[PDB]
Amino acid sequence: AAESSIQVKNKGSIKLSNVKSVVNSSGKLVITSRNTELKLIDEFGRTKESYKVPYGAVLAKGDGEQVAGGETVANWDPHTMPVITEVSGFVRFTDMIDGQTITRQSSLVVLDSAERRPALKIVDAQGNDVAQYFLPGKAIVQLEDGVQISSGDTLARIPQ
Amino acid sequence: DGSDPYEEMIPKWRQLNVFEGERVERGDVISDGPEAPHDILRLRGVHAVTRYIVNEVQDVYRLQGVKINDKHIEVIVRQMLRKATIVNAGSSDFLEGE
């Protein structure tokens, strides 16, 4: 099932439990907790649907909202789990080597553990220090330095 | 964890799920995969291994269209939960399955 959309059989209000509220680039929120629970409350305390929500997911409608049914309540990338940004501002890239840790596809790879992962915090506005960024194998960041990315946004991670 | 760190080794053939701290509690999943029943008992408790084995066994039976009460599996699970291992002494017992 390549479709990441979650269908709702009955008009039950979503009850999200064991989640982390992180402000995203829009009114929706991104969950940074691996374990999450979803429940539907229509007219009584009995739940109807549970499903499962992976980390780095964006909910279509807020928690406790009476969902009309038949529409997606949360959307997430079914292949990659995005890594959220705790600090909003320019992306600080440390020890960026061209020709060894650069793979042209701007969208450029970060580094390769086998070939050689510097850790740095996201800049406040341009280069201010404010968070540890870990780059596993085949990790790629499409945001260059000075992109001034806001909190709750993530580029393609390209899992190994 | 404040004291007594748990040094665990991963042969790197399996990806590590939780990258940040997130205050990982006991029984949390470090990496994906089908968990052994032994691991659930050691960390999550007796009640968890009872619920896991019942659901796993009843899933096969329910798929074929067979009705078996859950009391008949908990009875058998009880018979597999004997022979504790002792980690303390003073009463003629020291590191032995009894």
Curated annotation (Swiss-Prot), chain B:
Use of this protein: Co-administration of salinamide and rifampicin or salinamide and myxopyronin suppresses the emergence of resistance to both antibiotics.
Record-annotated membrane-spanning stretches: none
Q: Which cysteines are cross-linked by disulfides?
A: none
Q: Which family does it belong to?
A: Belongs to the RNA polymerase beta' chain family.
Q: How would you summarize the oligomeric state and partners of this protein?
A: The RNAP catalytic core consists of 2 alpha, 1 beta, 1 beta' and 1 omega subunit. When a sigma factor is associated with the core the holoenzyme is formed, which can initiate transcription. The rRNA transcription and antitermination complex (rrnTAC) consists of RNAP, NusA, NusB, NusE (rpsJ), NusG, SubB, ribosomal protein S4, DNA and precursor rRNA; S4 is more flexible than other subunits.
Q: What does this protein do?
A: DNA-dependent RNA polymerase (RNAP) catalyzes the transcription of DNA into RNA using the four ribonucleoside triphosphates as substrates. Resistance to the antibiotics salinamide A, salinamide B, rifampicin, streptolydigin, CBR703, myxopyronin, and lipiarmycin can result from mutations in this protein.
The protein's name is DNA-directed RNA polymerase subunit beta'
Per the UniProt entry, what species is this protein from, by scientific name? Escherichia coli (strain K12)
Underlying gene: rpoC
Fragment boundaries within the full protein? 1181 to 1278 of 1407
